[PDB]
Amino acid sequence: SWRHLVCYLCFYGFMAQIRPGESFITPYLLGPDKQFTREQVTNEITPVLSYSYLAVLVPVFLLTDYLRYTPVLLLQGLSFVSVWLLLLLGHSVAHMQLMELFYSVTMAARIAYSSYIFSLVRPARYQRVAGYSRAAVLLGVFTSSVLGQLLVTVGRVSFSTLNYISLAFLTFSVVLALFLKRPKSVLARMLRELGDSLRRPQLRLWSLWWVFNSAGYYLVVYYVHILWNEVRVYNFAADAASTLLGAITSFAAGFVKIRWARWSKLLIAGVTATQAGLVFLLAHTRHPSSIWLCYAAFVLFRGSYQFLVPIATFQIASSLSKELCALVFGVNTFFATIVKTIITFIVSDVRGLGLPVRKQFQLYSVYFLILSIIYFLGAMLDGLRH
Numbered sequence: 185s186w187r188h189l190v191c192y193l194c195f196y197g198f199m200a201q202i203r204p205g206e207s208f209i210t211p212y213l214l215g216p217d218k219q220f221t222r223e224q225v226t227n228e229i230t231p232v233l234s235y236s237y238l239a240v241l242v243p244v245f246l247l248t249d250y251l252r253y254t255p256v257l258l259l260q261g262l263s264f265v266s267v268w269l270l271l272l273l274g275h276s277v278a279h280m281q282l283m284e285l286f287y288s289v290t291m292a293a294r295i296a297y298s299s300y301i302f303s304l305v306r307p308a309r310y311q312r313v314a315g316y317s318r319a320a321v322l323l324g325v326f327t328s329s330v331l332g333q334l335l336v337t338v339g340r341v342s343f344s345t346l347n348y349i350s351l352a353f354l355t356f357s358v359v360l361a362l363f364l365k366r367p368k369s370v371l372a373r374m375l376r377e378l379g380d381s382l383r384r385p386q387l388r389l390w391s392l393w394w395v396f397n398s399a400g401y402y403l404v405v406y407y408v409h410i411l412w413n414e415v416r417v418y419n420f421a422a423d424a425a426s427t428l429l430g431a432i433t434s435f436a437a438g439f440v441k442i443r444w445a446r447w448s449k450l451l452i453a454g455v456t457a458t459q460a461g462l463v464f465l466l467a468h469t470r471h472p473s474s475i476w477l478c479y480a481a482f483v484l485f486r487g488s489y490q491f492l493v494p495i496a497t498f499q500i501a502s503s504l505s506k507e508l509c510a511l512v513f514g515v516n517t518f519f520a521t522i523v524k525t526i527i528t529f530i531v532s533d534v535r536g537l538g539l540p541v542r543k544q545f546q547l548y549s550v551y552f553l554i555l556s557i558i559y560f561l562g563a564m565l566d567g568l569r570h
């Protein structure tokens with residue numbers, strides 16, 4: 185129980201994120217084995233992920249609290265396995281949409297893991313465990329991407345073989361999830377407790393942070409590969425180093441000692457202001473001998489956000505005097521994606537304000553600046569109301 189509760193939980197998080205084939209799904213689909221064209225992949229596969237993620241996220245946070253966070257973690261493991269089973273056995277676009285549907289389920293089930301670590305350990309160690317699990321999750325993402333590239337670049341093994349390596353690892357993650365300790369109108373009660381909990385000032389500040397800052401962070405991270413492509417060993421190294429830096433900063437967030445009643449709004453504003461300038465750095469820089477600076481801007485931006493996520497998870501869980509840690513996590517992830525979709529519609533899509541990728545980032549930079557000013561203002565009014 186001593187070693188089991190914390191070390192094994194981080195070990196599961198580290199090994200659940202081991203996916204050599206996750207970053208090479210599209211090239212594997214667009215390959216000699218499966219013989220799929222770009223139009224089928226772009227128009228029939230990727231949109232299914234977007235729609236199914238929203239339709240699966242809504243039930244996932246309602247059920248993970250009641251069914252406890254073990255079956256959903258076990259469901260996440262099984263759902264991931266069926267994704268690669270359909271990848272290695274699929275022949276038509278129908279199989280690919282089903283595996284994209286299963287893939288969307290898996291991304292909806294990561295809120296269960298984040299809340300699971302909070303139900304396992306006493307509230308005293310909420311901050312340290314939050315830093316540990318996020319560090320373990322990001323260390324898994326980093327070592328999955330690096331081992332994924334190494335097997336394909338310095339290694340000569342085919343995509344099908346590389347996907348087999350993921351399948352064996354993913355089965356191991358399923359086995360690991362099978363030994364996780366399960367902690368010991370209904371809809372009206374949880375919604376009523378949702379409103380009562382949101383009345384607290386600490387959770388409300390961080391929940392609003394989750395909705396908006398994560399939407400901006402995901403917008404930057406999602407519209408970053410295209411931005412570099414619009415301008416192949418270097419666009420991964422930034423991704424690999426960004427996840428590594430996020431792991432270190434998330435690990436360091438479980439050891440920071442800050443009085444989370446007076447310097448909470450200021451810390452959010454300081455990080456958001458840093459991200460606002462950093463995103464602007466990624467945008468307004470186009471010199472050929474300046475791409476290294478752009479990657480340097482990206483890694484710290486990823487680290488700055490991933491530094492505050494364990495803090496946000498720790499504060500929300502500590503401010504929730506109920507077993508509703510997952511429901512708030514799901515609601516914030518629900519609204520963050522909705523806000524992310526809304527900004528994409530206005531800033532990127534033609535029916536709204538059509539801009540090229542360069543113009544989008546400066547729009548995202550001012551979006552962060554508005555967010556930073558709001559938190560800076562929010563801290564000042566809280567400060568004058570000492």
Ligand SMILES: Cc1ncc(C[n+]2csc(CCOP(=O)(O)OP(=O)(O)O)c2C)c(N)n1
Binds near residue numbers: 405
């Ligand atoms: C067809 C297809 N299915 C799945 C993927 C993988 N995928 C789609 S959305 C997504 C999440 C975006 O990752 P990111 O924002 O970098 O994650 P984080 O750093 O927050 O863990 C991933 C991994 C893909 N590229 N293509």
